[PDB]
């Protein structure tokens, strides 16, 4: 935030003072370890019978 | 923690001053094992001195 690698001069960098960091809150969806579709889908042989 | 001092009182003045102190102060939401934390910090500070 003070010293940069950027090729732009300091007058550009004072115009490029970025946004403040994002306020993190707790997520709502399931994590990607639990992201899957439905298991135990039964066979279609019961529809062909009855 | 915050240190609080009482000095040079009789019995009734001690009662009235402690009651007037605890009638105005409002506590809340203490940490669970803060006693062992204070023990370790107190022993550390006096071992330093």
């Amino acid at each position: 935030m003070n010293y940069n690698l950027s090729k732009y001069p300091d007058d550009v960098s004072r115009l490029f003072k970025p946004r403040p960091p994002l306020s993190y809150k707790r997520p709502t969806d399931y994590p990607y370890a639990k992201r899957q579709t439905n298991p135990n889908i039964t066979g279609v042989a019961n529809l062909l019978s009855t | 923690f915050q240190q609080f001092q009482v000095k040079a009182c009789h019995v009734s003045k001690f009662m009235n001053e402690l009651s007037n102190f605890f009638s105005q102060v409002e506590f809340g939401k203490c940490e669970a094992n803060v006693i062992n934390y204070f023990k370790r910090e107190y022993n550390r500070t006096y071992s330093q001195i």
């Binding site: 010293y3 940069n4 950027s6 732009y8 007058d11 115009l15 | -």
Partner: protein, 195 residues
Amino acid sequence: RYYCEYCHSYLTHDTLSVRKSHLVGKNHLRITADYYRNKARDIINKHNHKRRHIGKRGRKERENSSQNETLKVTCLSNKEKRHIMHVKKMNQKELAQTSIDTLKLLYDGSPGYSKVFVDANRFDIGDLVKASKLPQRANEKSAHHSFKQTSRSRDETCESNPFPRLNNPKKLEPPKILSQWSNTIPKTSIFYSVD
């Protein structure tokens, strides 16, 4: 094909090695920096005023307001307001560019000055300083400056400079005051200061 919106220059079929080299060259840097400066200056300088809404005011407000007093309007000529607004613009830009740098020059003889304040032996952002040196592939950019670098290494210890007053320090800068309100300074000091 590739077209730079900044430099207004075309290109051949879109190669990443050519497009990466285009954003490093100095002409693209100058045009991009000037364009960002002018667009920021335009969005600051655009005085988007509110659209006025004038209603038919009340009667007693008119008998109260038209009898209290009539104020005096001040106004200036064209060159006066132009010079004053130019001085205000240079004051706004010199306040936007400045910053307080008292802690850097006030802890200059500190034993950890070479580990935090040197800004090159810093831990988290020192690799960013050591990465892009702007390696000065022009010989004139390296032959122009003939002064010392004074690069303070991290390995400087407390054994070097033991007494900070024998090695000649600098007297600290006075607290700067506003030049428009400089005529109300106490002209008589408390103690006699020589030189």
